[PDB]
Amino acid sequence: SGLVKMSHPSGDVEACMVQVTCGSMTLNGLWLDNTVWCPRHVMCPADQLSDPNYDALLISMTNHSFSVQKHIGAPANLRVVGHAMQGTLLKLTVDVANPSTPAYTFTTVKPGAAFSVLACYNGRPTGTFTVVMRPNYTIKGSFLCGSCGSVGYTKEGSVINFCYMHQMELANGTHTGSAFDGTMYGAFMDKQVHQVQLTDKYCSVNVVAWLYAAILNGCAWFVKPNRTSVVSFNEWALANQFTEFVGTQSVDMLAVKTGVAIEQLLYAIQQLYTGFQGKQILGSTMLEDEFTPEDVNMQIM
Amino acid sequence: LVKMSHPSGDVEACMVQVTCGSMTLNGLWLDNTVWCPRHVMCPADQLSDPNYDALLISMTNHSFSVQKHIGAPANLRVVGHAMQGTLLKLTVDVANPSTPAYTFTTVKPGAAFSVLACYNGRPTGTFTVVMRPNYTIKGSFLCGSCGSVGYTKEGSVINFCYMHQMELANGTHTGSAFDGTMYGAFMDKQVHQVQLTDKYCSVNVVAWLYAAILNGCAWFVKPNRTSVVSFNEWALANQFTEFVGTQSVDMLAVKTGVAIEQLLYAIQQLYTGFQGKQILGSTMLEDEFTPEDVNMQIM
Ligand SMILES: *C(=O)[C@@H](C[C@@H]1CCNC1=O)NC(=O)[C@H](CC1CCCCC1)NC(=O)c1cc2ccccc2[nH]1
Ligand SMILES: *C(=O)[C@H](C[C@@H]1CCNC1=O)NC(=O)[C@H](CC1CCCCC1)NC(=O)c1cc2ccccc2[nH]1
Structure with a gap:
């Protein structure tokens, strides 16, 4: 019934x-x-x-x-x-070390990767949600005025990775900020001026994970025998608003647990991008690039 | 959103x-x-x-x-x-020194709460769900997650409203309220049980469309309106829930200046079909955002 x-x-x-x-x-x-x-x-x-x-x-x-x-x-x-x-x-x-300082690092997130945000106003944590860093280096969150300084992070073992501190809302309801090295995501400017964002793309690798998540949940009408190589897909992706697909061991794992090759889903994606023919996949009539291979592996296991 | x-x-x-x-x-x-x-x-x-x-x-x-x-x-x-x-x-033998100010309340279908998923007594993940009219939740739970707690916070008071007990035949979930009763009257026995056919949360589709009007999507809005009671009766046969107005719903009706009844006429219209058009990028009715969400996120 989905993630x-x-x-x-x-x-x-x-x-x-x-x-x-x-x-x-x-x-x-x-x-x-x-x-x-x-x-x-x-x-x-x-x-x-x-x-x-x-x-x-x-x-x-x-x-x-x-x-x-x-x-x-x-x-x-x-x-x-x-x-x-x-x-x-x-x-x-x-002059005081924080007595509740967790083990931590400062690593920059690359587009497609997911992370948790704690939304704070006046120092008071008020809500948490997850986003993915879009290819245009923006995120689709919920940030009202006063939320700046709110932090994005992931946790692995005992170590929190702080990856994001909130700075601005762009003209659309889209948000962006800094990494903890100081750079802004997308090289946007911390100044109230007009800045035009590049186009958003589909995170190909997260689309594949979501398709795998459908297959693990009995929804496999989109799977066919036909295949598209990584190289053909990455050529087609350049011309169709899709990120280049780099395989990882989390994807390979889903390929194994399912019997369906990455290349079958690469071909599937080229078909589904045109339209779903009126059918649904995990309750969607559109492609879904907001769950990662790691998300799918951890939540369906 | x-x-x-x-x-x-x-x-x-x-x-x-x-x-x-x-x-x-x-x-x-x-x-x-x-x-x-x-x-x-x-x-x-x-x-x-x-x-x-x-x-x-x-x-x-x-x-x-x-x-x-x-x-x-x-x-x-x-x-x-x-x-x-x-x-x-x-x-x-010991009283939890971090015992928060808490209450125990049973959540009603359509209401949203937060789930802290834990494993071996260690929190690992947090998510939000709305209680479905068949008294299930669309969660994300694996073996060892039983005992994980759902709750809402009214200011400083934590209202514990859910303790996880089981996955159903679908990947859908239920648990107990802290009075000890199971949501949906599901039994704590390993037998195939049957969810009631789900319905749409009427008060939450209204909120969803009040967000659309707030965010420039008023195409569906017509000067035609349907009463609460007439929709209600219609809802009982088209698998929709009973609409109960609320303060937060009224505010989404005050500052968008649209009447609740108009949306309840639209929703009977769009249940058949959307005419091919889309509301906030969606081809179907959305019922898992509450009036309090919309109020809080589109202040
Ligand atoms: C922090 O607390 C800020 C976050 C945004 C407020 C509303 N939702 C948010 O995410 N607020 C800001 O206003 C930020 C202010 C500084 C930006 C960097 C330089 C010094 C001022 N300004 C904006 O986010 C901003 C940009 C806009 C374009 C068009 C309309 C409104 C805009 N607000
Ligand atoms: C609590 O630690 C778990 C969590 C399960 C694990 C898988 N996904 C979950 O949410 N609950 C169970 O293991 C229950 C056992 C209870 C059943 C009722 C008696 C009390 C113990 N089993 C299920 O939740 C469940 C649903 C389901 C559907 C189809 C086949 C089997 C099945 N088991």
Whole structure:
């Protein structure tokens, strides 16, 4: 009866959320050890959103320009003792290590990969959901005003990978932000100006996983004997709004558990892209690229 | 238009593992009380036709083991067992110091709650579901997930409303409310049981279309309207649920300035077909977004 949008348990990340106020601006921050991360446009005045001088605002700030507050669970007094800038991010040093700092890394997500988001307002976690990083380096989330600094992450074993900190909503209801190295996803600009996003594409490898998920659940009308090579598919994909397909051991696993080759689904996808002939697949009349091979392997097992 | 769970940090602090003999599953530790499915007691021999009263009579307090694997690790001593419907209510020696402010309420079809899926007493995933009119949920559960808890938060109060018990013939799921009753009156026995044919959640299709109007999709909206009571009667034969208005529904009718009755006329129109057109990229009726979702996400 299909998968669900599964996100990781947010408790590790909840204990890390704080409010950062600078001047007129209030937004969320991520407190790990003696560091609080937050978008650097917390420095920007309300008048100069269109094109800020970020280097002039940082020279203009002091440790006393920033307040940090922890409201949820174990509360604390947090005093900023250093400030620095890293791409589109601020790196605030505070005088207290977070006593609930999880094991963590900073790795950038590539398009098609999924991750959990905790949506916070004024330092208060309010909801969690999962997104996939689209090929145009945007995500389809739920972000209202005040959600900036909200964090995206995945967890593997004991280690959380922080991959995303929320910065802006584009003209469509589409969102984007930074990785924790400071770069913005998509090389968008942290300035209120017109930025036109490239076209969204189908994440071919996640389409295949979803098709495998249908096959494991008894829905296999789309499977035929015919096949399309990875190389033919990747040529057709260039000309049809599809990402290039790179196989992984998670896909291979589904190929094995099912008896249906990757190439059969590559051919299937070329057919289904045109239309479903009025039939459904796992309750959809469209292709589904928002579940990964890892999602399918973990939820149907 | 996204599916959003509550932050699960509060519930994670109450998850525990409960072992009775060879069977293990998840419990919910609150105060001195640990709730879990009673079928922890059922040996594999009795899975098809379990006598729980007999199984219960056979248990001492020492037949049960409660382990806390996450947070402040510990072993709790079981000092009391009782059965409450399809749930086991054990009494332990230590009161959970992270016991949140909680209530126990039964959710009604169409209502959305958050599920914390756990395995061996360890949370592994969170998701949201709406309770279906056949009193099932379209979840994602595997072996060992029994005891995983669904809940809503009204401000600071956690309302525990679901404890997972079983997968049906379809990949569809049910469990117990914390009064101990099973949703859909399904039985805690390993026998093929029959879901009632599902219906659409009428109050949630309305909300879905109030989101469309809010997000520039008013094609279906006609000045033609149908009463609640007439739709209701129609709904009982076209597999739709009974519409019960709410405050949140009224706000989606206030600031889009559309009347509820118009949508209830549309939905009888679009149940036959969409005329080929699409609402928010969909060819069919959507019933798993609630008025509170729409209100919260399109403020
Ligand atoms: C953070 O708390 C922000 C997130 C967005 C608010 C609503 N939903 C969101 O995701 N808010 C912002 O307003 C962001 C402000 C800074 C951007 C970087 C430079 C300094 C200002 N601005 C926008 O997201 C934004 C872009 C828009 C284009 C068209 C209409 C509205 C827009 N808002
Ligand atoms: C709790 O730890 C589980 C979780 C199951 C595992 C697979 N997917 C789930 O949700 N529940 C079970 O193992 C139950 C056993 C209970 C049955 C009633 C008596 C109490 C124990 N079995 C099922 O849930 C179930 C559904 C189903 C459909 C078709 C064939 C078998 C089958 N078993």
